[PDB]
Write an enzyme that holds these catalytic residues in place. Structure first.
Site, short mmCIF file in Angstrom:
data_model
loop_
_atom_site.label_atom_id
_atom_site.label_comp_id
_atom_site.label_asym_id
_atom_site.label_seq_id
_atom_site.Cartn_x
_atom_site.Cartn_y
_atom_site.Cartn_z
CG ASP A 196 -0.27 0.00 2.55
OD1 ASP A 196 0.93 -0.39 2.64
OD2 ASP A 196 -0.91 0.41 3.54
CG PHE A 204 8.64 0.87 -3.98
CD1 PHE A 204 8.82 0.50 -2.65
CD2 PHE A 204 8.09 -0.04 -4.87
CE1 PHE A 204 8.49 -0.78 -2.21
CE2 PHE A 204 7.75 -1.31 -4.44
CZ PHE A 204 7.96 -1.69 -3.11
CE1 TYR A 261 7.83 4.18 0.82
CE2 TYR A 261 7.54 5.74 -1.01
CZ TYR A 261 8.26 4.69 -0.42
OH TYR A 261 9.41 4.18 -1.06
CG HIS A 315 8.19 -5.21 1.34
ND1 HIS A 315 8.82 -4.07 1.78
CD2 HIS A 315 7.22 -4.80 0.49
CE1 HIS A 315 8.25 -3.01 1.23
NE2 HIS A 315 7.28 -3.43 0.44
#
Length: 226
Positions: free
Chosen positions: A70, A82, A72, A192
């Site tokens: 999801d 990102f 920031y 991740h």
């Protein structure tokens, strides 16, 4: 019945996805719910950035799909997975991404900014599986109804294109694996990048993506162009 502009997607993506009237309604209802939530809470990114990823890429020019969780959750979200606005510090996830490129990709040097729009214009689609988050609360929109939409997009890219690479990072991205045609595409999975699956440090996804791309007579991604 649906003003296609209320869908927020660039129109190339509307025709590519060719959503039925039903799915357009389903999307409009979700967008409406998000708007109503914005009266009480702060949601990231702004309403006008939820589909920013559609405005940077023509869908046929996709080479690599990178998939996050999801957005920031403390101001940094731009609408592209990102990526960060120049006002903000490079968060831990992107620093770790750069560390892998630094360690693995020749002549990659780590930039002082976190802007990934250069990757977008080279056909890297930077997609979150959930396109919103409540300020402060990570994963807080996890079961709000983004999942069918992002799953639908991943399926369509897979069905409509040949020989793309999908980099799926962490559990939620990796859940989409069964949607991608194994006889046409490459999928590379890792844990991740923020600090069961293969380690992210050492994954070499960026050079492997390019190896596959070059092999199919496609033009590489210059990961160091930032």
């Amino acid at each position: 019945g649906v003003d296609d502009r209320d869908l927020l997607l660039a129109p190339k993506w509307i025709s590519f996805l060719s959503l039925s009237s039903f799915l357009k309604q389903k999307l409009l209802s979700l967008l409406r719910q998000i708007r109503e939530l914005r009266l009480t809470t702060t949601v990231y990114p702004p309403q006008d950035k939820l589909m920013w990823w559609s405005h940077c890429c023509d869908p046929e020019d996709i080479k690599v799909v990178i998939l996050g969780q999801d957005p920031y959750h403390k101001g940094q979200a731009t609408g592209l997975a990102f990526s960060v606005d120049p006002q903000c510090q490079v968060p831990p996830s992107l620093r770790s991404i750069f560390r892998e490129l630094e360690a693995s990709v020749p002549n990659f040097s780590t930039p002082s900014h976190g802007c990934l729009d250069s990757w977008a214009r080279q056909g890297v689609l930077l997609l979150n599986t959930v396109l919103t988050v409540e300020k402060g609360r990570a994963g807080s929109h996890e079961g709000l109804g983004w999942d069918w939409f992002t799953s639908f997009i991943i399926s369509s890219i897979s069905s409509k294109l040949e020989h793309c690479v999908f980099l799926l990072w962490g559990r939620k991205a990796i859940d989409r694996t069964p949607l991608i045609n194994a006889q046409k595409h490459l999928v590379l999975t890792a844990q991740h990048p923020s600090p069961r699956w293969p380690r992210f440090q050492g994954c070499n996804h960026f050079n492997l993506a390019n190896d596959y791309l070059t092999r199919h007579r496609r033009e590489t991604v210059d990961w160091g162009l930032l």
